[PDB]
Every structure is written in C-alpha cells, then in structure tokens.
Amino acid sequence: SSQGLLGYYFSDLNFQAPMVVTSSTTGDLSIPSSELENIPSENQYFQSAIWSGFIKVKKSDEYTFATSADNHVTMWVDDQEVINKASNSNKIRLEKGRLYQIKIQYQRENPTEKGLDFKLYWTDSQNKKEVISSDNLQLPELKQKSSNSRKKRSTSAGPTVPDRDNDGIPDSLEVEGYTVDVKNKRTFLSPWISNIHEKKGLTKYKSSPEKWSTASDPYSDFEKVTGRIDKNVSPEARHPLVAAYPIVHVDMENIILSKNEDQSTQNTDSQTRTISKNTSTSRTHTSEPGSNSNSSTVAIDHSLSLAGERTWAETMGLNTADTARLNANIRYVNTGTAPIYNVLPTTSLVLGKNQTLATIKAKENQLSQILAPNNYYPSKNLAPIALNAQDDFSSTPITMNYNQFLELEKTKQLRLDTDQVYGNIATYNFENGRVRVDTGSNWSEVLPQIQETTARIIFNGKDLNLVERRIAAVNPSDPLETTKPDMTLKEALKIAFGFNEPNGNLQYQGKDITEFDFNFDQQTSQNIKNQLAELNATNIYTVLDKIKLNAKMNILIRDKRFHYDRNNIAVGADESVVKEAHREVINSSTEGLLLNIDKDIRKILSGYIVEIEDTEGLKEVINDRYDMLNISSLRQDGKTFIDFKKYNDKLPLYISNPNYKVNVYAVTKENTIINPSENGDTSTNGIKKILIFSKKGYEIG
Ligand SMILES: [Ca+2]
Ligand SMILES: [Ca+2]
Numbered sequence: 001s002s003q004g005l006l007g008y009y010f011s012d013l014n015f016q017a018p019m020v021v022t023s024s025t026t027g028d029l030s031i032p033s034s035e036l037e038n039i040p041s042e043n044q045y046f047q048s049a050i051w052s053g054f055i056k057v058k059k060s061d062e063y064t065f066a067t068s069a070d071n072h073v074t075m076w077v078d079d080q081e082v083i084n085k086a087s088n089s090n091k092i093r094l095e096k097g098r099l100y101q102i103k104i105q106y107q108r109e110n111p112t113e114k115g116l117d118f119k120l121y122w123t124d125s126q127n128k129k130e131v132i133s134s135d136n137l138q139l140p141e142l143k144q145k146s147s148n149s150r151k152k153r154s155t156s157a158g159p160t161v162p163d164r165d166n167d168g169i170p171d172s173l174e175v176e177g178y179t180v181d182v183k184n185k186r187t188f189l190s191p192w193i194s195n196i197h198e199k200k201g202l203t204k205y206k207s208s209p210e211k212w213s214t215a216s217d218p219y220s221d222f223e224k225v226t227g228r229i230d231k232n233v234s235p236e237a238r239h240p241l242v243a244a245y246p247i248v249h250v251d252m253e254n255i256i257l258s259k260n261e262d263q264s265t266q267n268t269d270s271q272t273r274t275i276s277k278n279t280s281t282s283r284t285h286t287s288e289p290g291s292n293s294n295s296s297t298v299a300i301d302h303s304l305s306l307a308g309e310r311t312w313a314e315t316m317g318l319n320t321a322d323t324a325r326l327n328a329n330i331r332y333v334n335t336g337t338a339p340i341y342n343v344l345p346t347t348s349l350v351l352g353k354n355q356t357l358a359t360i361k362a363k364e365n366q367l368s369q370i371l372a373p374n375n376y377y378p379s380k381n382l383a384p385i386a387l388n389a390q391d392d393f394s395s396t397p398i399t400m401n402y403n404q405f406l407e408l409e410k411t412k413q414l415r416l417d418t419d420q421v422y423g424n425i426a427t428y429n430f431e432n433g434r435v436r437v438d439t440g441s442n443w444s445e446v447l448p449q450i451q452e453t454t455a456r457i458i459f460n461g462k463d464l465n466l467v468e469r470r471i472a473a474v475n476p477s478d479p480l481e482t483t484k485p486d487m488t489l490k491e492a493l494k495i496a497f498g499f500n501e502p503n504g505n506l507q508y509q510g511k512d513i514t515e516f517d518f519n520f521d522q523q524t525s526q527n528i529k530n531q532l533a534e535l536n537a538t539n540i541y542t543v544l545d546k547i548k549l550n551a552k553m554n555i556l557i558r559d560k561r562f563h564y565d566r567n568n569i570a571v572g573a574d575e576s577v578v579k580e581a582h583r584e585v586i587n588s589s590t591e592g593l594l595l596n597i598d599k600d601i602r603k604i605l606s607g608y609i610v611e612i613e614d615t616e617g618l619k620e621v622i623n624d625r626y627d628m629l630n631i632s633s634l635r636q637d638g639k640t641f642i643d644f645k646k647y648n649d650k651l652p653l654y655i656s657n658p659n660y661k662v663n664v665y666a667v668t669k670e671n672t673i674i675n676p677s678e679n680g681d682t683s684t685n686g687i688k689k690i691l692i693f694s695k696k697g698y699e700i701g
Contacts, residue, residue, distance in 0.1 A: 001185070002228050003433040004137045005029065005053040005102065006168060008161050009116060013047040013109055015159050018170050020046075021189040023139060027120035027132030036115055038181045038190055038197070044114035050161055051104040051120075052154050054138040055094070061124050062091040068119045069106065076103040079155045091125075099138070099149050105159050139430045142168040142222060144212050150431060164210050168222035171209035175485075178205050180225045187226045206485035207240035208472075214484055215243035215472045216449035217338070218425045218441060228428045230339065230435050234373040236469070237337035239495050241487060243450045243470040246443065247336030248371070249283045249296040250347050250360070250416040253384055255328040257408075259316045260399060262323075273316050277301045279328070281416070283335065283466050284567035285458050285556065287521060292451050294345065294418040297567055302412055302674040303607070303630040309682055312409045313402075324405045326357070326398040329384040332377040335467055340371040341437050343423025350415040351404055357414075358398040360387065364423070412674050420447055453481055455553035459497050461508045461516060464559060464570045464603055469496040475551035489555075490544035506544060511559075514541050519556035527553065562604060563670060570604050572668035575690050577601075582666065582692035586639060588700050590652040592631075593642040593664060593693060606672035608632055608642050609689050612653060613661040623647035624683050626673040658698040665689035 004025040011017045019039055020031060029051060036044045055077070057063070065082050067073050075083035078100050082092055094100065106118065123129040141150040144166065152166055162171040169178065169189065177192035179202045192204045207214040207221040214221050221240040223229045229238065237244035257275040261268060278301040283294075306315060318324060332344055344362040351357050371377040378384065388395040400408065408414070422443035426435050454470035471492045475481035490506060493499040499508045506513040518540060520528060528540070528547060537543045549555075558564060563572035573581075581601040587594040607629025610622040623631060628647045632640055642664060644653050653662060671688040 001025065001433065002226070003139060004134060005051045005104075005120075006140050006142075008050045008170065009046045010048040010050075011043045011045060013107055015048050015050060015105075015161055016172075018161070018173060019043050019190060021169065021173070022186050024137075025134040025185065026137065027122075027130075029116070029118045029120060031115050032117075033114035035183050035188070038179065038188065038200075038202075040193065040196070041114070045111050046116045047108060047111065049104075049106040049116060049118070050159055051102070052140045053102050054099045054140070054150060055102050055132070055136055056099050056138060057094045057096055057136060060093075060095045062093050064089055064091050064123045066121045066123070066129075067104070067106075068117065069108070072106055072108045074105045074158060076155050076157050077101070079157055081157070101151065101155060103154050103158060139433070140168070141430050142166055142220065143430065147431065162209075165208070165212045165221075167212045167220040169207065169209075169225075174207045174209040174221065176206075178225075179203065180205070189222075189225065203239070205240060208480075208484045210480060210483045214240045215470070216446070216453045217244045218427060218443075218446050219244055223428050228433070230426045230428075232339035232370060232372045232426075234337035236496055236498065241472040241485070242337070242496050243454050243472070244338040245336055245447060245450055245470070246334055246338050246340045246371070246373075246422045247294065247468055248340065248345050248422070249281075249294050249333050249335070249418055251281045251296065251331050251333050251376070252279045252298045252414070252416065253281075253329045253331070254278050255298075255300060255326060257312070257316065257405075258325050258327075259318055260323040260325050260397065275306070275312060275315055277305055282567070282569045283333070284569060285466050285468075286567060287519070287554070287556065289521070292420075294420065296416045296418075297569070298414040298416065300408075300412040300414070302627055302672075304625070304627045309676075312405065318402065318405065320402050322402060324400050324402075326400065327386060327388045329386055330360070331380075331384050332371055334371050334373050334375055334377075335465075337373050337469070339373060339426070340367075340422050340443075341424060341426060342367060343421055344371065344377065345419045345421050347416050347418040349398065350417060351400065352407060352411065355404065357400060357404075358387070358396065360416075410675060420444075422447075453478075453551050455487065455492065455549040455551060455555065457492060457496060457555045457557060458568075459493075459508075459516075459557045460559055460568075460570070461497070461511065461557070464562065464600055466568060467497075471496050471549065473549040473551050473553065478551070481551055487549045488545050489540075489547040489549060492549055493544070493557075513544065515560055516557045517560050519558065521554040524553040524555060559600065561600065563668075565670065570600075571670035573601065573604055578605075578666050578668070578690045579692055585693065588693070588695060590644065590655065590662075590700065592644040595640050595642070596638070597640045602632075602634065602640065604668050605632070606630075606667050606669050608692075609665040609667060609684055609687070610642075610644055610653075611663045611665070612655060613663055615657065615659055619663070621684055622653065624685075626676070626682055626684060626687070629667055629672075629684075655697040655700075658696065660697050661694055662697070662700060663691060664693040666692045 004023045006023050008018050009020040011019045033044055070087035073083050119131050122132055141147055141152045146152040179190055179192050179197050181188050212220050219229050224238045224240055233244050236242050255277055279298050281296050281298045283296045342365045347360040348356050349358040424437050425441040427438045427441055428435050455473040456470050458466050458468045460466050472484050473487045474484050499506050561573055561577050562570040565571045581598050585595055608631050612620045631643045631646045667689050676682045
C-alpha cells in the first residue's frame with residue numbers, strides 16, 4: 001500500500017522542476033490528469049520523470065523489461081542499462097530472493113496530454129508479459145544508512161535528482177515549500193502555490209534539504225508527511241519542523257502509610273492503623289538554568305480522613321525508634337509526541353530536597369502495553385500500578401525513619417524525578433513498508449540532538465497542565481542548522497499546539513493569544529528583546545509573525561487568569577477572577593449552593609469556608625477547621641455543589657434571624673493551610689479567603 005516504486009514527475013524536460021513526488025504499488029506508474037487538482041493546468045504537462053526502487057523476483061528466470069515508451073526511456077538494473085531509447089528483447093537473468101536496484105528515466109518534449117500514462121512491463125521465459133505486480137516492487141532505501149540488502153543511493157549512472165539528505169524529498173521542494181495531498185491509494189507531494197493551496201487550508205511545509213529529519217528525531221521528513229510512520233506518533237509531530245519524542249512523568253493517585261514490623265514485635269495480630277490519603281500530582285517546570293528533565297510533584301491531601309485530631313505518629317502508634325512504610329498507586333504519563341515500547345524510565349521518589357526514599361523501576365522488555373502520547377501506562381481503563389504489588393515477593397519497602405515521617409507529615413509533599421531512558425524506537429522499513437521496533441535504534445541516541453537543535457515551548461492552555469513541545473529552529477552559529485527554514489513564534493504555536501487564526505487573531509481553542517503570558521529564560525529573553533528592538537516593536541503580541549525562534553530557546557506560556565508557584569503549577573487566581581467565576585448561582589438553600597464553575601477555577605481551589613454573620617457583625621464559622629474545607633463536589637451535570645451540611649453534623653444551617661447573613665468563601669491552593677498552626681490551633685482563623693457568596697436568610701429561602 002505504501003510500497004512500490006518512487007516517482008518524480010517534472011514539468012520541464014530536464015529533471016529540474018518536480019511537480020509530483022509519489023509512489024506506485026505496481027508497474028503502472030501512471031498519474032491521470034484527474035488526480036492533478038492541486039497543480040496548475042499548465043504544469044500538468046510532464047516532460048520528464050524518474051523512478052527508483054528495487055525489484056524482487058519470486059522465481060529465478062530470464063526476464064525482458066519494457067515500458068509504454070521505450071523510445072523515450074532509459075532503464076538501469078543494478079548499474080546495467082537494459083533499455084536505451086529503444087525497445088528490445090534482451091533477457092537479463094534474475095535469481096530468486098535477490099534484490100535488484102531499478103532506475104528509470106523518461107523524457108518527452110511538448111506532450112499533448114496532461115498527466116502521464118506510463119507502464120513498466122516484464123516478460124518471463126514462458127512469454128507471459130504483464131505490468132510488474134506489486135509483490136515485486138519496493139521503494140528505494142530512503143535512510144541515512146544502507147541495508148544489508150538495499151543500497152541507499154541509486155546507481156551513479158544517469159540522472160540523479162538532488163536529494164542531499166536521502167529522505168526522498170528533492171532539495172528544491174524542501175527549501176521552497178511543498179504540500180502533501182491524499183488521493184485514494186496515494187500521497188502526492190507537490191510545490192506550494194499560494195493562489196491554489198492557501199484557501200484549501202492545506203499545510204505549507206518547509207524542511208532542511210540537508211537534514212534527513214529536520215527536527216533531528218528518528219523519523220524522516222518524507223516518512224512524516226507521507227504517513228510512513230508509527231501511527232502512535234502525535235498528529236502535530238507529523239510536521240517536519242515538530243520534534244517527535246516521548247516525554248514521561250509519574251502520576252501518583254493515592255498513598256497508604258503504615259508502621260513497619262520489626263523483629264522485637266512478635267505479635268502481628270494488632271488492629272490496622274494505616275493512614276490512607278488521596279494525592280494530586282503535576283508535571284513541573286522550574287526554569288532552573290538549562291534543565292532538560294522530567295519531574296512531578298505530589299501533594300498529599302490534608303483534609304479529614306480519620307476520627308480525632310491525632311498526629312500521624314499517634315494514629316499509627318509510631319514511637320521515636322520505629323520506621324514507617326509507604327505504598328502508593330501510580331501511572332506513567334506520556335505528554336510528548338512519540339510512544340515508548342520496551343523500557344519505562346527509572347524514577348526516584350524524593351522527600352524534601354534530596355532524600356531519596358525509593359527507586360521505581362519497571363521490567364525492561366516486558367511492558368504490558370505501549371505507552372502512547374497523550375496516554376497513560378497502564379491505560380486508564382485498567383488498574384494502576386501499586387509500588388508494592390501484591391504479586392511480587394521482591395518489591396522493596398519504601399521506608400522512612402521517624403524524623404522523615406514527621407517531615408512528610410509537615411510538608412505533605414513528595415517529588416518524582418524520572419530519567420529520559422526510553423528504550424528502542426519503532427521505525428519504518430522501506431523493504432516491506434512496515435513499522436516495527438528496531439533493536440538497533442534507541443531514544444538515547446536521538447534526544448540530545450533534538451534538545452540541541454530545537455526551540456522549546458511549554459504551554460498550559462490544555463487544562464492548566466504543562467505540555468512541552470520542541471520545534472526545529474535555526475542556530476545562527478551552526479552551519480547545518482542554518483539550512484532549516486525560518487521558524488516564527490506564531491508559526492510554532494500553530495504547528496506545535498494547534499493555535500489557529502480565524503479572524504487575523506491567533507487563538508487556542510477560542511482563547512486569544514493575549515490571554516496567555518510569555519516567560520523566557522535569560523538567554524531567550526535577551527534574544528527576543530533584541531529582536532523587538534530591531535523591529536521597533538513595543539508589544540510582542542502584535543508581531544508574533546516577525547519574531548524568529550532559535551535553537552535552544554526556552555519559552556513558557558501560561559494562562560493569565562492564574563497565579564503560579566515556583567514549579568509553574570497553577571495555585572491561585574485574582575480575587576476578582578474568583579469572585580466573577582462564582583457569580584452565577586443556580587440554587588441556594590440552608591443545605592448549600594449550586595453553581596456553574598469553570599473547570600480551570602476548580603483546579604485552583606482547595607475548598608470553601610461557610611459562615612453565618614449575625615446582625616452585630618459577629619461571625620459563626622460552620623466548618624471551622626483547616627482539614628474541613630473539602631465541602632465542594634462536581635456533579636454529573638457538571639455543576640458544583642457546596643455542601644453546608646457535611647461539617648454541620650449533617651444538619652442544614654440554622655439561621656436564627658432572617659436578617660443574618662450566610663457568607664461563603666473560596667480558599668485557593670496557595671492560601672491553603674495544611675497543618676495545625678505553631679500554637680496548635682486547627683481552626684480557620686487567619687486563612688486568606690475570598691468572599692464568593694453573601695445573602696441574607698430571607699434571600700436564600
Ligand atoms: Ca531531501
Ligand atoms: Ca530533509
């Protein structure tokens with residue numbers, strides 16, 4: 001289907017102006033004018049063509065080759081001319097199993113017909129003549145190295161279309177711009193033409209004629225745009241200027257803490273005294289100078305989980321000489337653009353700044369599934385991974401000493417640092433048109449070059465989670481990288497993150513670019529500042545099409561509605577933003593509130609505080625504990641219910657006098673208290689909170 005001979009069809013007589021590059025499954029090398037919609041009528045006249053590939057025969061025999069136009073043809077079989085601007089009967093000997101290179105050149109001045117009707121035939125010894133069947137034809141070896149059986153360059157004999165990097169796309173097309181269009185069986189690669197392609201909404205591709213993969217990744221520019229690629233590669237990374245590579249972190253979903261058995265305690269029949277909590281994990285980004293790492297930070301829920309207000313040590317019966325154990329459920333998360341097949345990266349679980357508690361490893365070459373971009377391992381429809389799995393006897397206990405345990409109780413934070421060891425790559429094979437894991441290809445041989453030759457943009461517009469993409473961008477200091485096309489900031493956002501521009505305004509899923517801020521590392525900042533100066537531009541948002549990206553830039557783009565911590569996780573929002581987001585109330589009663597709150601807003605809240613204010617201005621706080629703010633819940637209808645009864649002993653609010661007020665406040669994550677105060681107070685006193693509802697008793701009704 002993606003197999004056959006590779007054809008270059010030129011409008012000129014001398015192989016200089018390629019109009020179509022495409023493959024044919026069989027010896028029928030025709031392109032009917034019917035298929036030439038994406039090309040100017042006057043360019044539909046092909047005056048020359050070149051085909052290349054291999055022939056593989058199923059049965060040894062003497063064959064004669066012929067075409068539809070032997071008078072206008074020269075054909076080579078492994079360096080040997082077999083057709084020379086004349087028909088013949090010259091039999092060449094071909095043995096089973098062996099691969100023979102084919103090159104065919106065709107020239108015809110002033111054809112009176114558009115397109116090309118051209119067929120390649122052969123006749124065996126039993127005088128059967130037919131168009132060469134698909135099972136006999138293979139593509140050229142369009143790789144950076146030759147195969148054991150398939151040479152990567154064609155014979156030096158005759159015409160060679162300029163293709164300096166051997167990806168299959170002619171030099172001139174990569175530099176000047178090309179488009180890819182799908183017919184029924186085939187993809188046509190053609191020159192970009194403004195008045196034809198711009199309105200069809202087609203993508204204008206440019207790539208380096210000297211880089212087989214312009215993003216320095218393991219898939220060629222041609223493989224990408226023709227679909228000759230792992231189907232798990234992200235759609236945006238089918239662009240030659242967008243890097244395809246995995247990006248993995250670990251998501252911890254929950255945790256259970258328990259007291260370690262010790263030799264001194266013979267009795268193992270005591271009551272369960274474990275501490276189980278939900279956890280929230282986010283991939284982070286620090287802008288630590290020059291970082292290329294995977295890390296996520298885990299927040300352990302501080303809300304009420306057990307009776308009493310005991311310390312963790314009291315709860316678990318942990319004395320100063322005891323040790324504790326941690327178990328947890330996790331999944332791996334691929335937020336990058338290429339899949340992983342046979343090695344999951346190794347992860348350190350870290351307490352505080354640098355106390356490693358555990359090393360989390362999966363079994364090499366024994367993965368239960370692929371870990372695909374925009375997906376999880378295990379998939380979300382399957383159980384997560386327990387750090388100590390019930391099956392294996394050999395899972396190492398994740399242990400903490402007493403002082404570390406107290407530290408975890410106080411910080412309620414863990415960090416997961418994951419390496420970039422991703423194993424082997426599934427590559428396309430031109431011999432059989434299949435994609436398979438290549439044991440000779442490893443991500444560790446690719447990632448450094450990707451990181452060195454691309455600009456990185458990290459964007460949080462999808463659910464406020466950080467997503468990293470890398471886009472091919474010139475390095476003015478590296479001659480090879482100057483052969484890449486100019487990459488603008490605007491173009492990068494379109495191709496890497498799917499920004500569009502319906503009315504001259506760049507948007508991401510309906511949000512104008514101006515709704516996001518720009519943040520740069522030191523070197524990138526100075527670079528962009530210089531560019532703006534050179535442009536006499538005072539506002540980056542009005543010149544995004546004129547700002548050029550360079551290799552090694554780091555750009556961080558964030559939703560402006562939110563406040564961010566040092567890990568660039570969203571942790572709060574302006575009082576005015578939070579207020580407005582709670583303005584539309586659906587229903588109110590002494591039982592609670594029913595609102596429609598933006599999904600992003602909910603992400604930055606830790607909970608709510610409910611208060612009744614009497615006529616003299618005194619306030620009764622109903623859920624007056626730092627661990628009792630979790631009173632909101634998302635309903636199946638998407639609406640949020642704030643539950644007044646939960647921490648009111650299951651009772652609706654009692655409002656003594658209709659003139660009393662019910663006030664509800666939102667508490668953002670950055671303002672959230674996660675421990676009792678120093679003086680031991682567990683109340684909400686002093687919590688910085690945002691009034692989001694205030695009605696008198698007669699208004700609630
Ligand atoms: Ca090329
Ligand atoms: Ca290229």
